[PDB]
Amino acid sequence: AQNPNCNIMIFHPTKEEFNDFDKYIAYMESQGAHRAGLAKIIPPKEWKARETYDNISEILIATPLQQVASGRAGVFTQYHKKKKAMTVGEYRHLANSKKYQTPPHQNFEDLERKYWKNRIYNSPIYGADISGSLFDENTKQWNLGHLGTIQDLLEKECGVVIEGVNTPYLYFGMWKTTFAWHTEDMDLYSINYLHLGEPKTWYVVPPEHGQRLERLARELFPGSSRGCGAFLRHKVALISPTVLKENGIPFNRITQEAGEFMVTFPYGYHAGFNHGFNCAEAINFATPRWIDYGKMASQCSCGEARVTFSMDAFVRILQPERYDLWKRGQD
Ligand SMILES: O=C(O)CNC(=O)C(=O)O
Ligand SMILES: [Mg+2]
Ligand code: NI
Numbered sequence: 432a433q434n435p436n437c438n439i440m441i442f443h444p445t446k447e448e449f450n451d452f453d454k455y456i457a458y459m460e461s462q463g464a465h466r467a468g469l470a471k472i473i474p475p476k477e478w479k480a481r482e483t484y485d486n487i488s489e490i491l492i493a494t495p496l497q498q499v500a501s502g503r504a505g506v507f508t509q510y511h512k513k514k515k516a517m518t519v520g521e522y523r524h525l526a527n528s529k530k531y532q533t534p535p536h537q538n539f540e541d542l543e544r545k546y547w548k549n550r551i552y553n554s555p556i557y558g559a560d561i562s563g564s565l566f567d568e569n570t571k572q573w574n575l576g577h578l579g580t581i582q583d584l585l586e587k588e589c590g591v592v593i594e595g596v597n598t599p600y601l602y603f604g605m606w607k608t609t610f611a612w613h614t615e616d617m618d619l620y621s622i623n624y625l626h627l628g629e630p631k632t633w634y635v636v637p638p639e640h641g642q643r644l645e646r647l648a649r650e651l652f653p654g655s656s657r658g659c660g661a662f663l664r665h666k667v668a669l670i671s672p673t674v675l676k677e678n679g680i681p682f683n684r685i686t687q688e689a690g691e692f693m694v695t696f697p698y699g700y701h702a703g704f705n706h707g708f709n710c711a712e713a714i715n716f717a718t719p720r721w722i723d724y725g726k727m728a729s730q731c732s733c734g735e736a737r738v739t740f741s742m743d744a745f746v747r748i749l750q751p752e753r754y755d756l757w758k759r760g761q762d
């Protein structure tokens with residue numbers, strides 16, 4: 432078995448190898464990359480996502496989210512308070528202010544320490560889930576707005592034809608902005624490209640050990656657990672590496688820098704934070720191997736996680752028994 436310790440793998444495709452996206456994903460899996468839950472892909476040196484970022488300040492963040500924490504430094508929840516709209520120019524200036532900027536630090540490790548020690552005491556502002564793309568339409572390789580769609584994968588593998596579309600989303604981050612522990616909707620893959628700015632640190636649990644993280648989460652957030660049988664779908668819970676190590680949960684960590692891709696694999700729990708002002712683009716995708724994960728994916732039926740138009744159809748076709756009760760939570 433390849434990659435039996437479930438380490439995060441890092442790939443350096445040549446420009447020739449960067450032409451066929453599906454084939455490269457299948458290559459990485461042949462090397463065991465999926466066992467980690469997360470892989471890094473460094474694009475060929477000749478490749479670019481676009482020519483410059485010189486005119487991005489006019490993008491609107493219509494609903495910036497202030498991430499307010501509750502709990503203790505290693506075990507907390509966050510709630511997202513909606514703020515008034517601001518442009519990416521305004522947001523970048525805010526990120527660079529004395530109140531919000533990255534503190535002095537020695538290296539990524541000292542910064543990681545400062546994040547876990549100090550995150551709960553602050554409320555950084557995240558511009559998340561903004562529909563759109565920063566890939567130039569002329570970028571032909573690994574353009575996250577030109578991937579094969581999940582609906583088309585389901586049609587090719589299963590013969591069924593369903594409604595729905597699959598488009599990318601932008602994320603504008605600042606120091607301390609946080610993504611809580613989660614898997615993707617319907618335990619899909621995701622791909623995330625860091626277009627610009629400061630790094631993003633990731634934590635991940637191997638898919639084969641995801642249920643260990645779930646059991647710890649039920650112990651650490653016991654009222655949330657009683658409220659919903661899949662409460663990590665709410666994307667509000669944080670657990671530090673120190674707490675994971677104390678509880679024996681297998682995980683790995685890696686820092687993504689500007690110009691790098693990350694891929695998350697089906698049922699790979701992940702969480703992380705941003706080091707400073709940055710912009711990432713991400714989208715879900717599927718392969719044939721995903722289908723069985725989609726059929727088994729948990730769902731939030733308490734109604735908090737409240738998910739997309741396109742996820743309806745996935746549920747309807749892959750989880751017809753759940754269909755019914757799940758759409759009761761989504762209506
Ligand atoms: O970048 C972020 O804030 C969160 N992104 C992801 O969880 C992802 O790409 O799957
Ligand atoms: Mg602009
Ligand atoms: Ni994710």
Ligand SMILES: [Zn+2]
Binds near residue numbers: 662
């Ligand atoms: Zn729920």
